[PDB]
Design a protein around this ligand. Structure first.
Ligand code: 73B
Length: 109
């Protein structure tokens, strides 16, 4: 769980105010009704968000670092899948993923 402690640190950073400018769309599940998005749940079969990830870390539902990484990347992929390349939210996901991947890359073994 030493690797997972470092994952928990990474999660904290993603959720900190420092990255709030581009992280906010990912705090919570996409609410398709509230946003008026009729086709979202058809196009995206495995929704993911930072709250779910946080919950799974807290309940210790991750077996390892790479399970955590798959969830974080799923979240970014859903966003890239669903939205157009020029959409602000795509620019925002890329900024956050930059933080994620760099930190994740800097984990020990
Ligand atoms: C993740 C993803 O791809 N999407 C997503 C998810 C959640 C929210 C969202 C979340 C919170 C609020 C709010 O609290 O007001 C509003 C919209 C918005 C979006 C995206 N919409 C959006 C994002 C950024 C900007 Cl600057 C303008 C529009 C679309 C997409 C479904």
């Amino acid at each position: 769980s030493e690797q997972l402690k470092h994952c928990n640190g990474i999660l904290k950073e993603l959720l900190s105010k420092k990255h709030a400018a581009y992280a906010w769309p990912f705090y919570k599940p996409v609410d398709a009704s509230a946003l008026g998005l009729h086709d979202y749940h058809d196009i995206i079969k495995h929704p993911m968000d930072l709250s779910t990830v946080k919950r799974k870390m807290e309940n210790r539902d991750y077996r390892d670092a790479q399970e955590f990484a798959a969830d974080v990347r799923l979240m970014f992929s859903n966003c890239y899948k669903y939205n157009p390349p020029d959409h602000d939210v795509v620019a925002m996901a890329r900024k956050l993923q930059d933080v994620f991947e760099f930190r994740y890359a800097k984990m020990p073994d």
